[PDB]
């Protein structure tokens, strides 16, 4: 049996109606639903989980305040420990990105300055393939450099000109002959070299008394190697230190 | 006073009975429990926090939609802001780890790639103790190296052989006498050095016209120093660049 | 609105009218109204369920992070980056993460830095590098030179790199460790009498934090010499 609706139960208690035992039985069970709802009838175990019943008789929410839920006058809210990595807005709950962290579709991820030598991929954070240039710039305190497949050169302005530290690549080394190293199309004034047998010499420092190094100036050079007698003639442009 | 149960109370309105005032009081108070539960009786302040009462009289949950909770057809739910760092499954709420982040029992952590020169410890993320090898490999654009306690050497394959860039370690330097530097048991062809006193000379660049560097080849060498006249007799083997 | 309970009782005091019964029926109907059980209603509100015994029960969405148990309504965290205390839900930081006013990268002296724009190498990371390259345990660095010291046998040998356009002289007396002149030295060579020291050794002097390094720095543009006085620092 489902209890009658209100309008129907009422006309059972209309003037000049004979209210039967079963009409009162319907009234009692109707009245009893509020007590069943709060778990108060014989054989019930009290308010369901998540509910309390006050002494005034009010049904009340039981938030586990130790497990991240609070209830107040604005309603049921997630309890975020403030400034501890989490953030809540009308949009929902989210992680708050501090220094070095970025948050986007992939999730919480590492943000790096690429100018500063670091990579981040699927496999984790790491040095990129040009971190070494930044290292070498700091080593010599160079404000400009060139790099290509046969040489790299780190430029230091000083006095009326500049001096550069030189390193070979791919097996190659830098010629030290006059006319083989041009900054801004100017031949060099001085070089210091490492020496090999039979007039082989490899330029390790180069200096221009009156030519300055700046972003965009050209570097022209003759690279040599210890296996063949040929020579690459490079023409590149200076770039500011990273 | 604790209201009678439904069957007991029914019995007081049985056929032929004259219900007393106290039977009706019991009925009224039992009917009243619905109103009490929603804070509707005199002395009460209306629905408890977390609850609302519709114009139809229905009890309803009041999620604070500005603070992380939603209620829909599916139930009471945490509202996660989409793709802002957090995730939710049947297993619970979790952090979504993007590139360079890993999540484990320890918590949210940085993942570093193995061979790219980084470390992560409880003191933070830093460079590991062999990062310099990756750096020197990119500086010279080398695909192979050896490194032990007295030298490291960086190998560049070119033309019919290869040429190597040499750095001393632990106070030591590479001899440049013929027969003192062997790749694959072959003596070197040409070499480039820095000069010391008398016959002191330190190999900086070593060449083999017709021998290629490759993982597993042996590198044998005579390391020397400026304090004692003794030599170290090295025999290591080439590893690929990081 | 409906009579309060004590007003109702007066109407059923020791013959009730139909409007009294009506108020009692309507009063009794409020429990059913609340659980969405009357004609014209669609059952319990969202977030509520009604058990077969007739008890109102919460409906947590067990797949959207809420559980209800004996202890109350709770956030359901997977134990996977998150932690809940009496102060609420927060992020659990592992190795390389710090938590404070959001989630940030922590760096160790180990060459890395973190700023507004991300994690990168700092400005002295190259020192850790040249220390590992040469296996040096002490260095100096100033504007015109840097030097990496390697203790071995009875004394010390160092590798040298010029900075700012400069180079280290190799004249006896121009390079002092603990105020002692060097013994052996190895150079790159230039025109006339220009040479640049790249390895320098003291047979009976050791490197250690504190020891002074004095040197004569030179360059290729001018004839002048910087007169350097610095002190050795431990490798990072």
């Amino acid at each position: 049996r489902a209890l009658p609706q209100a309008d129907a139960l009422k006309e059972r208690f209309k003037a000049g109606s004979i209210p039967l035992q079963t009409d009162f039985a319907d009234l009692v069970d109707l009245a009893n639903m509020g007590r069943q709802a709060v778990g108060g009838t014989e054989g019930q175990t009290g308010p369901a989980n998540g509910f309390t019943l006050s002494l005034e008789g009010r049904l009340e929410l039981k938030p586990n305040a130790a497990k991240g839920i609070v209830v107040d006058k604005d309603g049921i809210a997630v309890k975020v420990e403030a400034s501890k990595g989490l953030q809540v807005t009308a949009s929902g709950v989210s992680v708050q990105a501090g220094d070095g962290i970025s948050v986007a579709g992939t999730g919480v991820a590492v943000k790096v300055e690429a100018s500063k030598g670091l990579q981040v991929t699927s496999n984790g954070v790491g040095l990129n393939n040009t971190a070494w240039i930044k290292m070498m710039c700091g080593l010599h305190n160079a404000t400009f450099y060139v790099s290509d497949t046969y040489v790299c050169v780190f430029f230091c302005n000083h006095s009326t000109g500049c001096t550069a530290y030189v390193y070979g690549r791919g097996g190659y080394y830098l010629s030290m002959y006059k006319g083989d190293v041009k900054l801004n199309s100017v031949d060099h004034n001085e070089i210091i070299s490492m020496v090999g047998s039979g007039s082989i010499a490899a330029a390790t420092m180069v200096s221009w008394k009156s030519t300055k190094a700046a972003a965009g100036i050209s570097f022209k050079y003759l690279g040599k190697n210890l296996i063949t007698s040929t020579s690459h003639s490079g023409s590149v442009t200076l770039v500011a230190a990273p």
Side-chain angles (χ1 to χ4, degrees), chain A residues 2-13 15-17 19-66 68-83 85-208 210-242:
Chain A
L3 317 182
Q5 303 295 315
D7 63 347
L9 194 49
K10 277 150 167 211
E11 40 169 339
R12 302 298 301 160
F13 293 90
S17 182
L20 316 176
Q21 178 185 26
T22 47
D23 300 314
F24 286 95
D26 286 349
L27 195 48
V28 161
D29 284 330
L30 190 43
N32 208 30
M33 282 183 71
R35 165 164 70 186
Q36 299 182 306
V38 301
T41 68
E42 49 197 17
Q44 283 185 292
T45 45
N49 278 333
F51 287 133
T52 66
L53 198 69
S54 71
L55 269 300
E56 289 78 51
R58 204 157 59 150
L59 198 78
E60 284 178 341
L61 283 193
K62 205 201 146 167
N64 191 332
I69 305 281
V70 288
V71 178
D72 73 11
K73 55 195 72 59
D74 300 298
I76 318 162
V78 164
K79 199 189 198 175
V80 178
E81 177 155 0
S83 305
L86 296 182
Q87 188 191 23
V88 70
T89 69
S91 300
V93 187
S94 71
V95 194
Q96 182 192 1
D99 273 349
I101 299 292
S102 174
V103 183
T106 51
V108 175
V110 160
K111 190 206 199 273
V112 307
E113 312 209 17
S115 58
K116 298 281 167 301
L118 269 59
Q119 263 184 353
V120 59
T121 61
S122 317
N123 316 307
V125 197
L127 297 161
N128 66 48
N129 284 113
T130 54
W132 66 266
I133 297 171
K134 191 189 179 62
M135 296 318 216
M136 299 300 288
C137 278
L139 160 69
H140 300 290
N141 209 24
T143 52
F144 293 108
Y145 72 92
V146 290
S147 187
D148 71 352
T149 40
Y150 310 99
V151 73
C152 54
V153 176
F154 304 95
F155 287 96
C156 295
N157 287 319
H158 69 103
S159 158
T160 57
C162 76
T163 301
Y165 303 81
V166 179
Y167 297 87
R169 306 184 86 217
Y172 274 78
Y173 70 87
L174 186 61
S175 179
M176 42 75 69
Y177 284 148
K178 192 73 71 177
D180 285 4
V181 192
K182 285 174 201 285
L183 194 64
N184 203 40
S185 297
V186 183
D187 283 340
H188 71 86
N189 281 99
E190 307 285 334
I191 290 171
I192 295 148
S193 308
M194 317 191 277
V195 289
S197 84
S199 312
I200 281 152
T204 54
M205 285 161 89
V206 192
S207 164
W208 291 266
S210 63
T211 301
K212 284 288 168 178
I217 303 283
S218 82
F219 187 69
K220 288 192 244 158
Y221 70 92
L222 215 66
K224 298 179 165 211
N225 78 35
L226 291 178
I227 294 165
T228 77
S229 52
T230 48
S231 291
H232 170 240
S233 53
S235 186
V236 301
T237 42
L238 276 58
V239 182

